[PDB]
Amino acid sequence: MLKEGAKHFSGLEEAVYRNIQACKELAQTTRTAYGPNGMNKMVINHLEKLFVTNDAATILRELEVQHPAAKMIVMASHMQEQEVGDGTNFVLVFAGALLELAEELLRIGLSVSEVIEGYEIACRKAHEILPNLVCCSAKNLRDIDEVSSLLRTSIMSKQYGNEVFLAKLIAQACVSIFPDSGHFNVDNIRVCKILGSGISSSSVLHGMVFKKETEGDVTSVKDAKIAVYSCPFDGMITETKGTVLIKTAEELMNFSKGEENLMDAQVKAIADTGANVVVTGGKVADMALHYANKYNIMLVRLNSKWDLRRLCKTVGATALPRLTPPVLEEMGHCDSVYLSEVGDTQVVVFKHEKEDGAISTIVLRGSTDNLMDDIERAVDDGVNTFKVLTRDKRLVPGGGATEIELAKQITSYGETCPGLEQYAIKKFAEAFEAIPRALAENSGVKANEVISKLYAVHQEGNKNVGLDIEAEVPAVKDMLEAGILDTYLGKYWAIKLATNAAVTVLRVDQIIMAKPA
């Protein structure tokens, strides 16, 4: 009319409407998950493979939204993902509940400043009262079952069928390096895929693990310096065709002898300079393997960009795809390279650990390539959850037993200070009842009776609804002796990010114009 060009429907009335409906429609395609349930969704983008996923991370990473209100939450989601391990749908659910509860306050007739102040006061009160429900704590991290229970509890959120063997494997792989005390890295654990048997035959192995065959000889010496290259066996001599049938044998024999002499001089110069082995990334030839066998030089076969990228980012060499024989400028720190036979396949093992910065690589195997993705996701999630950078994790009874207690505390605190700040406190307290409802609605029964039962027993804070049929209607179980706990700092960071996102959304809310060309 005066500013926009019939593109967006912004003005002095869309605030208490579209800015909330967009977030509601964005969050409605997410409440179907959140909990140990089988709600797989297929993802079709550019790979054209038709794969089903369960986590919301890969779902949000593929969906393209064209709205600022929906894009204001993916930033906080990525920030929470970069900060701690898990935690993604909680912030979205909290923001959606806060917006749905503030819509009524805005429709009644209240300013946004009072609502923002009340939300900030409620968030401060929740952050102050949070360090008070600490039950269990971490004792010694040098044991096995102490961390295995936490790993099983973290894996049970994703996979419900098999969760003991994977947790035990992750615990054995993490305890063989370094604990949380001192220094522990994350990018030192690799996951390899082996197409063979099922998942009931996995094992662990310390060091580098790569599925690369060997057509030469077993070189178990320490002077075998590595030498990575791009495509050394490509084509240094390009041969063309003269006639149609065949040419003279003299010229072909001369060219073959010249190429053989050139490659012999090349391998002699690359072996006499201080490099017994060579990493190739091209094709093979009969004379090539003949020279490799007669010169006692290990020759690989399988080539991959990820392998050379990892070798470059770990050692620190540089590939030299040149025709003329260069000089030795790829000296690294590896020396102990051994060969092993696993699953009738030749694998390499690197030994260079000096009791500092050790690496590990778990051996994974499955049926198809569409099943190891969930296993790798569970493994990396458990690895990220194991890292907490503190000796005492101060675990709290998660699953919804603390949300009701926090809501009751906020409700009891809000019924004291007078003024027009009680409505926002009551809304922030009532917004905490969105976790048990989504967990009860995604099972098979209703959620009102579950909430009434949880509010009718006692204010102990250790009661939550189970997963079996004998725990849906009563929902009276003690999760303290079962082993279901959550991260203390994770919930705090999630609540902080949700409050920040809600404040940012409620602040910037007027007219959305455009920019001139």
Added chain:
Amino acid sequence: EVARAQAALAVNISAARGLQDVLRTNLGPKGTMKMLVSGAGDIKLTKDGNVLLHEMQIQHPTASLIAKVATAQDDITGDGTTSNVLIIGELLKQADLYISEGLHPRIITEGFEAAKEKALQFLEEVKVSREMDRETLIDVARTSLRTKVHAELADVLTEAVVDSILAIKKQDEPIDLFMIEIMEMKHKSETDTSLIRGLVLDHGARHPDMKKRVEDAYILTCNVSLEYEKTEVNSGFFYKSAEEREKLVKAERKFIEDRVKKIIELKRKVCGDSDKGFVVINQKGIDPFSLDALSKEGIVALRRAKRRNMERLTLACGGVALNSFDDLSPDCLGHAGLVYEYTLGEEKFTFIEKCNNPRSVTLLIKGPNKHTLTQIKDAVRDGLRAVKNAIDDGCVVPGAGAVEVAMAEALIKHKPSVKGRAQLGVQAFADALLIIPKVLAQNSGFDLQETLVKIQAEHSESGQLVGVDLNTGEPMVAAEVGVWDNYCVKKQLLHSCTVIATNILLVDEIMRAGMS
């Protein structure tokens, strides 16, 4: 082609009312922010007046011309582009109503000029002086930060601004805003500010871990070719023979060896110990084999330096930039007191302080890696501009809507002359000055007429400058809280409003012609 009516004034009044209604919810600290996105999906948050008026797509040519005229008069004072379109729109509406009633624009213009003169006289007679100290500047910077940024991080920036102003200003001549560099970084936190009393160098050295406690250091700026590249070159033209280029490379290597030997002997002559250090700034690369031999004796050489860095170094210290490494007079070597190396991110920074004549303060700010850092920079720039404007004069009048009420009371009651034709314009000019308190009370969340009549009764009973409270809506005095303003800003705003309202009512007809 032929048009003899009054539709031009009608469409002008309509466009003015539309422009006033579009921008009217950005007044006061409790305003609403705005967002702009169109080019490749770039989210940009803003709330200022000139920044919004400069980056918008207005479909009306009259509104675009009005915005251009308003922005063209913003380079005079600090920030006066806001709170201006409302009074102009009110005056234009009053003029249109008086024209529809039956009058001439000449009498309206004369009355507007008389009212402007009376308001100028009242502002000149009502001014008061105040001793400039530290609390006044602190309060001014706090009010500026509250009007710009939210009421959260507005406490850690005002102190740094006041400290930088006190460290820069120490003479009698007016200060200049060209010796303060505002840099930005990338961190994980939000509230992170620093006030460095020295210079900042982005680049450092390729071989760290040698020394960092260099007290009295000597810095020499040059631009010779120490080690640009190991590739063979000639004169910008490829040849065929390799003997000539290899001989040129050998000669260049011999020249580099001679230069490093000369600088080594110079460092050995001008020093000879470990306390007297030397630092060299060069824009070309540095070979590690020569860097090791240089550091073995106790002289650091930096590579990849920007032009602004060496410019600030030669302007703050005072050194001659030559193109030779010969043994010359040490008069061009600048002195450095303290050198520190900060390791963060993917590049180590260098901080030099305790030098001669500390006339270079750096306000380092950090953000959570987004677009709010530019907003914080604009806010601190507006705060520095307001502080500079509040330090040039010595008279500061209170604000918070306590000057327009007295002006209207003086223009309505104590009339300068007795004339109905002049009063017809005086009343219209006085009734258009009460839009600021009404808009403030509407945006604060209260009524519009109740607070107005309350302030009127409080001013009629007492007689002091009564302000507007944005908390309870009760009339209070703005002379005891801490709300202040400027002096020439109000005069410039009144002059701009009068100039805009004068050259608008004289529009006769608008024809459709022109080719260029």
Added chain:
Amino acid sequence: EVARAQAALAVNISAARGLQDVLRTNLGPKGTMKMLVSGAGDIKLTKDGNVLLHEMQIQHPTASLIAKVATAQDDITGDGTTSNVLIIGELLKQADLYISEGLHPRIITEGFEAAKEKALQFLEEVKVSREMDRETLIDVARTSLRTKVHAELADVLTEAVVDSILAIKKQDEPIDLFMIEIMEMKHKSETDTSLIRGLVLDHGARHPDMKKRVEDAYILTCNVSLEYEKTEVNSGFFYKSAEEREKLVKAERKFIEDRVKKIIELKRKVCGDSDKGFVVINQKGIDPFSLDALSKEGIVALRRAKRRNMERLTLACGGVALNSFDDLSPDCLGHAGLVYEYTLGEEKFTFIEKCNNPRSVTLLIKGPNKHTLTQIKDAVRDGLRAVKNAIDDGCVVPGAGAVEVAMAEALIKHKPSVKGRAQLGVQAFADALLIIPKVLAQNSGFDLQETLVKIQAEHSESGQLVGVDLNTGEPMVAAEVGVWDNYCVKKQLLHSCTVIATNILLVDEIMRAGMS
């Protein structure tokens, strides 16, 4: 069916503004006349307010209801239906503007009531008395005629009106406008008026030229069958035999002969000369053979008399109406002093005067045989009503637009209380009272604001009641020229305006329902 908006007030304000703009050019003596024609091409000329509002076709129901309410309040005082829609429209426009600005109708109604009370108190305190004589009534009637008829024949009309008022009013009780009969005739000239001190008889006699200088005359009113028709009758039913009807006719003739002999002997007994005349009034016909024998002795008998004529004759003189011509007491015979016969047109008129208790004055007027005679009659009726209204009281305040200025000055300056909410309505009520002088100056042929500010400056300098001049546009005093007004008329107008403006803003929603 379902409606929750504010369009009802909008359409009400629109209808009020339309009704105010339709009727606004009929104020002051220099107003433009209108015309109405629809029924069989009947040209009607009028200029009054109630007469126009009662005979019009309005397409708006709200305007029709407003006109009906305004006409239903004209039976209290004389003429107060005019100069009322303008103030109501101005008040409604001010209320709509204040509602669009943001206010509640309750505060507006309270302020309007307070302003009405203040204006009533000011009018009660500003009133003044004056001795009623002849010049004051003459000036009042002259102004009333000038406000209706042109300034040509506004002399012989007011002189005759004052003469009739002085001849009728002579007691202490309030006079009644039921003893003055206004008749009309048909002549060739235009200005022709007469004031008869006696009664008027339209019919006379069939055989004229006998006598007309009859001093003392005795009049007797009856209703017997003297000579209705010569046709044979019976009892309202035709028969077949002629002997019965001829015998009935013979008996009727014998009865008529007996009656005429009885009245002849009665005239001979009660008189016997030629000075004392005997006039007889009968509604039936008179035979010429008997009329000649009657006139031979000196008794005149009239035929074809109306009921109102004999009613006025028996009410002014005092006679008993019997149905017999017997010899009874002469107490029922009325006395007449002078009888005259005027011969003009196709029927001779009779004028009887010099009777007992002259309480019957006739205002005869002649026109050029058109429709302006009704307009002259309405004008003289309005003048008589104004004279009667100016004779019941003893206090007359000046007019010519000199009461509204003082009222506005007292309502604006000397405020009864200090309250912004009440002032918001007081200012709106005071700004609507200046709609009379502005419209008067616009209709006179001058400016609107120049004369207004001139009158304002004159009233601020001097302080007396300054009127509006309809000749040169200069401010003059209306207390020395001759312009006067009433007392209760202004109070009734203010009450009606307040009642109309009060029960309008309380309209919520207008739904479409009903069946009756």
